[PDB]
Design a protein around this motif. Structure first.
Motif, short mmCIF file in Angstrom:
data_model
loop_
_atom_site.label_atom_id
_atom_site.label_comp_id
_atom_site.label_asym_id
_atom_site.label_seq_id
_atom_site.Cartn_x
_atom_site.Cartn_y
_atom_site.Cartn_z
N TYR A 210 0.85 -1.18 0.00
CA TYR A 210 0.00 0.00 0.00
C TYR A 210 0.89 1.24 0.00
O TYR A 210 1.99 1.21 0.57
CB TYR A 210 -0.93 0.02 1.21
N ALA B 133 8.54 5.30 5.00
CA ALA B 133 8.41 3.93 4.54
C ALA B 133 9.34 3.04 5.35
O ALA B 133 9.98 3.51 6.29
CB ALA B 133 8.71 3.83 3.05
N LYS C 45 4.13 0.74 2.53
CA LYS C 45 3.85 -0.34 3.47
C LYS C 45 4.08 -1.70 2.81
O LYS C 45 4.16 -1.80 1.59
CB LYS C 45 2.41 -0.30 3.96
N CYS C 46 4.10 -2.73 3.64
CA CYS C 46 4.32 -4.11 3.23
C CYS C 46 3.24 -4.99 3.84
O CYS C 46 3.00 -4.94 5.05
CB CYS C 46 5.69 -4.61 3.69
N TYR C 47 2.59 -5.80 3.01
CA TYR C 47 1.55 -6.71 3.47
C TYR C 47 1.72 -8.06 2.79
O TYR C 47 2.21 -8.17 1.67
CB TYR C 47 0.16 -6.13 3.23
N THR D 4 7.12 -10.44 3.71
CA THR D 4 8.01 -9.31 3.96
C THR D 4 9.38 -9.55 3.33
O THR D 4 10.32 -8.79 3.57
CB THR D 4 8.10 -9.07 5.48
#
Length: 149
Positions: A86, A98, A117-119, A122
């Motif tokens: 995102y 970030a 972001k990271c979803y 990772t």
RNA sequence: GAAGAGUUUGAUCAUGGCUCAGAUUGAACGCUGGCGGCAGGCCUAACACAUGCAAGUCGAGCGGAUGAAGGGAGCUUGCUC
């Protein structure tokens, strides 16, 4: 671009019947300060060559990211594999917000208030992929609509 | 207006839990202490409670208790009617 940013080193092994021989891969990105980002890593024996065997492909595959000027184009929805990313633009005064491998790719593009972001996964191997597919489809005007807005 | 690391493997990737940075309290505890201002101080036994105090007020609402003074009468300034 000469504004390279190292992402990660990670100590790779593999096994021969004699024993375990170790190798280093290391991914770096290369940007121009205005938005041509690149990718790549190298497979060697040693640390100081595997970051310039990363440069072996990092100057390659450079694509002009379609900026606005210091600010990103849209709220972003993006993914590669099991990583999802995102992003959305910020206003004026905040800097790098970030994380990890997201601050490397989004600082060499000329935008500074990034908020990425990271979803999902990772893994920085697959993390930098979803960030450039977040930046591959940027357009303020390049839609084929017969209208300026 | 949103930052992640470390850790399964010979190495990888994915699913997935652990442990970690932070900020906090009505605070304890281990340490060592110069001061001011505002604060806050039984979180447990709604457990038992010595002691003093935490709501008495009014005589210009009413009967009734006690006699400040002062002016006088005798005895003669002690005493009372």
């Amino acid at each position: 671009g000469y504004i390279e940013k190292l992402v990660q080193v990670n100590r790779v092994a593999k096994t021969v019947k004699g024993g375990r021989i170790f190798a280093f891969t290391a991914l770096t990105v290369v940007g121009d300060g205005k938005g041509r980002v690149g990718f790549g890593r190298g497979k060697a024996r040693e640390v100081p060559a595997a970051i310039q065997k990363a440069m072996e492909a990092a100057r390659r595959n450079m694509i002009q990211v379609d900026l606005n000027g210091t600010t990103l184009q849209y709220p972003t929805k993006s993914a590669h594999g099991a990583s999802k990313v995102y992003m959305q633009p910020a206003s004026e005064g905040t800097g790098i917000i970030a994380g990890g491998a997201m601050r490397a790719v989004l600082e060499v593009a000329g935008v500074q208030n990034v908020l990425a972001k990271c979803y999902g996964s990772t893994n920085p191997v697959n993390v930098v992929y979803a960030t450039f597919k977040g930046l591959k489809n940027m357009q303020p005007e390049a839609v084929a609509a017969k209208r300026g807005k």
